[PDB]
Design a protein around this ligand. Structure first.
Ligand code: A1H0B
Ligand code: A1H0B
Ligand code: A1H0B
Ligand code: MN
Ligand code: MN
Ligand code: MN
Ligand code: MN
Ligand code: MN
Ligand code: MN
Lengths: 323, 318, 318
C-alpha cells in the first residue's frame, strides 16, 4: 500500500515500570504489546516510526518507604525523570510519543516530559482516578497517585517525596478529563468534586452514550483552542471480560466498541501528541488467549489512535483494476 | 444512613427446578451483610424462615402445582415483612422463587396504602391460574395482587387470605423479553406500563428510569417496592437461574436501575429472587450470580460507581 | 400468517474452511421448524439441496478458487428460489457460505425487480474477482449483483447466467467492521449507503433501522431481501463462523434489526449464512450459534420480546 488518508510520525518507548505497584508481571506489558504486532500495525497505517526500544530501570538500592506506606518512591521518581527526558526529546523532534507500560505511575514522567507543549490537555481513560495523594493513599502504590503530582491546584496537599523534587505541576484541574471511572476511593471522590475536575464515569456513559461523552470531552478541553492531546489509557478502563490481563480489574467497563470509539475520536481531532498504554500484565491472565486478547486490544487502541477505523478508509485505494 | 431488615425466604414450590431454596444462603455467603454494613446501614437480620410444610398438596384441576404450600409460605412471609416495615425498616427479602412476591408485596401493603412496584424481570409473572400453561405459581404472582384482575382470578386452596393491593397504574415492569400471549393481552388491555428489552434498546436505560418514576411518583411521593428477579440480567452475567432468557440487562444497566431507585430516597422494600446456585455448570458461575445479587442490593442502598457513599470531609495536609 | 419455504443450501466452495455445509442441518437441529410453526407460519421444507459436483474446476487466473462449482450451485439455487417464490412462499435459505447470496438474490429479482437488500454482516462482501486477495468467492457476491459495477467485473466460468439486478441505491449494509481498502473505495465511489459498527455506536440501532428504511422504502413499498451473515454478531455470541471479527452486534441489536424487518410486512426472502459448527471449540459453542441463527429467522417472521405474535382478545373467567 502506497497511499494513506494521513501520515503520522510516531515514536515508541517501552517503559517496563512495575515499582508503582505490587503485582509482578506488568514489566512484561511492553513485550506483550510488541508481540501482538504493534510496529507492523502502525507501519500498515503509513506511520513514520522511531522505535526508542525498551528503557532499562535499575532500582535504587536503599529506597526506603515514605511515611511507612509509599513504596519505592526514589525508583518511581527517578525512572519517571529519565522517561520524561525521552518523551520531551521525541515530542521536540516532532513525533507523537507512544509509551507502553508498565504501571500507570509512568504517566508522571510522560505527562511531565510532554509539558516541557505547556498548553497540553489530558484525556485519562481508566476505571480509576489515580488521584490519591501520598497522604490519602491506603495501599502506598504510586500507580494510584500520579495525577496528584501533576495538578497545579493540588500542590499544597502533596508532600515532597524522595526522588520527586524535579517535578513541577504542569496541568490545571480544567485541563484533564477522565473517562470510564467506576472504582473511586472516598478521598478521590472528594478531590474530583472539590477541585471541579470533569469526569465521565461509567454511569455518565450509560446516560449520555460514548458519542456525547467524546463531544463533551472535546468541548471542555479543545473547545476554546487547538491544544496538543495527551491520551493516558489504562487497559483496565475496558470490561475485564475484554481486558482480563491487568492488576485491578473492575466489572462493568467499556465495551470493545466504546474503547475504539474513544480512540477514533482522538485520532479525528488531529491533535494527539502523546499516548500511554498502561497496566497490561500478561501474568494475570488465566490463559494465553486471555493474555493475547488483552495485548491485541492494546494494539487496537494504539492503531485506532493513529487512523485504524471500523469502516476502513485509512488505506487510500487509487482506482479499480479493469478486466 | 438506612434502616435495613433482611429476611431469607428459602422457598421453591412456586416452580419445578430444585435448588432455588439455596439462593438466600448463596447471597449471604457472597457477603451481603458486610457490604450493607460498609454503606452505613443499621441492620436487622430476621434469619432464614422455616416455612410450615403442607404434606398433602398435589396438582389442582390437573394444572396448578403446590397451591396450598405456596399460599401458606406466602401468608407466613407477609407476617414477617409486615413486622419489619411497621418497625421502620426497608425490607430486603432473599429468594427463593418469584411466587414469594405474593407474600412480600401483601406484607408491605399492610402499612403502605399508596405503595408502587418496580418489577425487574425477563418475565411479567402475570398469568392468572386460568391463563397459565405451566401451572407454576412463580409465573402468576402479580395476578393475585392486581385489583383489576380480581374477577379473572379463581380462589385457589390456601389463597383466601390474599387481598388485591395494587392497581394497574401502580406497577411498572423493566426488562421483559419472554411474555406469554395472555400476559401480553393483560399488559395492553389493562394499560400496565412496561419497558421491555426492546424499549430499553430504543430509549436507553436513563429514559426508561425517568419515565418509570414519572408514571409512579410524578404526582406524589410513594414508598417503592423493588421486586428484582436475577434473570432480568443476561444469562452470561447471571447463569444460576431456572428460566434464563438470552438478551438481558447488562451489569451497567442493572446497576443503573438500582442507583436510580436509591436516588429517589423512597425504596421501602426489595425482593432479590430466583438465584438457583445448583443450576450453574461450575462453582465460579454460582458465585458470579450471588456476587451480582449483592451488587444489586448494595446499589439499591447507596453503593455507586463514583465513590460518593463514604463521605470524606478534609484531606490530610503535609 | 406467513407462508415460509426453508431451503438447505450446503455451500462450502465459496471459501476454504470446511464445515459450513453442515450449517443448514445445525439450524434445523436447533428446532427451526418447531419455532416457525409456533408462529403460525405455513411451512414447506425442501430439505438440503444436492448440487452437481464439478470434478475438473481449476483456479481462475491463479487466484479464484472453485469458480464453476460456486457458479453452477448458485444457478441451481436461483431456480429452486424462483420456484419457491412463485409458489407463494417467503424464501428462507440456510447456508452455507455467503457466496449463495448470488443464487438467492438472482432468483428473487426474477419475480421482484424492484427488490431492495438489507445486508447484515461484519463484511461488505463486495470485492471484485480482480480486487480479492484470498480468491474466496464468499468475499465477492455483491460485485456480481451490482449494476453500476458491471464494467469492473470479468466474466468467470459458470457466472455468465448472472444478470446484474441490484442498483447501488437499493442495497444498505448494517454491521460493517472489517472492510478491505478496495471495498471502502467501492462503497464511497458508488454511493452505497452503510451503517458500520461506528454508525451504530453513534445513532443506536433504532435510528439505524429508521434511516435504512428511509433510504430503501422512503418513496414506495418494495419487496425486502434480508441477507444475514451470522458473523455480524459479536464472536462471543456467534463463535461457530469462518471470519469472526471482535466488536459486533449484540443479541439485542440483531433481534431489533429482524423485528423492524418483520414490522414492515415487506420481507420476501431471507438468507442465514456462515454458521460452521466445526469451527466451534465445544458442543455448546456450536449449539449457541445455531440457536442464535433460529432467533434471527423467527424474529424476521414475528417472534417478539413482548409476546405479541399470537392474537389474544379475551381472558378466561372463573
Ligand atoms: O490507590 C490505590 O491503590 C487504589 N485506588 C483505586 C484502585 C487502586 C489504584 C489502581 C491504579 B490503576 O488505575 O490501575
Ligand atoms: O407461566 C410460566 O410458567 C411462564 N411464563 C413466562 C415464563 C414462565 C414464568 C417464569 C417465572 B420467572 O419470572 O422466573
Ligand atoms: O475477500 C475476502 O476474502 C475478505 N474481505 C473481507 C473479509 C473476507 C470476506 C469474508 C466473507 B464473509 O462475509 O464471511
Ligand atoms: Mn491507571
Ligand atoms: Mn486503572
Ligand atoms: Mn420472576
Ligand atoms: Mn423471571
Ligand atoms: Mn458475508
Ligand atoms: Mn461476514
Amino acid at each position: 500500500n502506497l497511499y494513506f488518508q494521513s501520515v503520522h510520525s510516531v515514536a515508541v518507548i517501552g517503559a517496563p515500570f512495575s515499582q508503582g505497584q505490587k503485582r509482578k508481571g506488568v514489566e512484561h506489558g511492553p513485550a506483550a504489546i510488541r508481540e501482538a504486532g504493534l510496529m507492523k500495525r502502525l507501519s500498515s497505517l503509513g506511520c513514520h516510526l522511531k522505535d526508542f526500544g525498551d528503557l532499562s530501570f535499575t532500582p535504587v538500592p536503599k529506597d526506603d518507604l515514605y511515611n511507612n506506606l509509599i513504596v519505592n518512591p526514589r525508583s518511581v521518581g527517578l525512572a519517571n525523570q529519565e522517561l520524561a527526558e525521552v518523551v520531551s526529546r521525541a515530542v521536540s523532534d516532532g513525533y507523537s510519543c507512544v509509551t507502553l507500560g508498565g504501571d500507570h505511575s509512568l504517566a508522571i514522567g510522560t505527562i511531565s516530559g510532554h509539558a516541557r507543549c505547556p498548553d497540553l490537555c489530558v484525556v485519562w481513560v481508566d476505571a480509576h482516578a489515580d488521584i490519591n495523594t501520598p497522604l490519602t493513599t491506603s495501599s502506598g502504590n504510586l500507580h494510584g497517585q500520579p495525577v496528584s503530582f501533576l495538578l497545579r491546584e493540588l500542590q499544597d496537599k502533596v508532600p515532597q517525596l524522595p526522588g520527586f523534587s524535579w517535578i513541577k505541576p504542569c496541568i490545571s484541574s480544567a485541563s484533564i478529563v477522565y473517562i470510564g471511572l467506576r472504582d473511586v476511593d472516598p478521598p478521590e471522590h472528594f478531590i474530583l468534586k472539590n477541585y471541579d475536575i470533569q469526569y465521565f464515569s461509567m454511569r455518565d456513559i450509560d446516560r449520555l452514550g460514548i458519542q456525547k461523552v467524546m463531544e463533551r470531552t472535546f468541548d471542555l478541553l479543545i473547545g476554546k483552542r487547538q491544544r496538543p492531546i495527551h491520551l493516558s489509557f489504562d487497559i483496565d478502563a475496558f470490561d475485564p471480560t475484554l481486558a482480563p490481563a491487568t492488576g485491578t480489574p473492575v466489572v462493568g467497563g467499556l465495551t470493545y466498541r466504546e474503547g475504539m470509539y474513544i480512540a477514533e475520536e482522538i485520532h479525528n481531532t488531529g491533535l494527539l501528541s502523546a499516548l500511554d498504554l498502561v497496566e497490561v500484565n500478561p501474568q494475570l491472565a488465566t490463559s494465553e488467549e486471555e493474555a493475547k486478547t488483552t495485548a491485541n486490544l492494546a494494539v487496537d487502541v494504539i492503531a485506532s489512535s493513529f487512523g485504524q477505523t471500523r469502516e476502513g478508509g485509512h488505506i487510500v485505494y487509487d482506482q479499480l483494476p479493469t478486466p
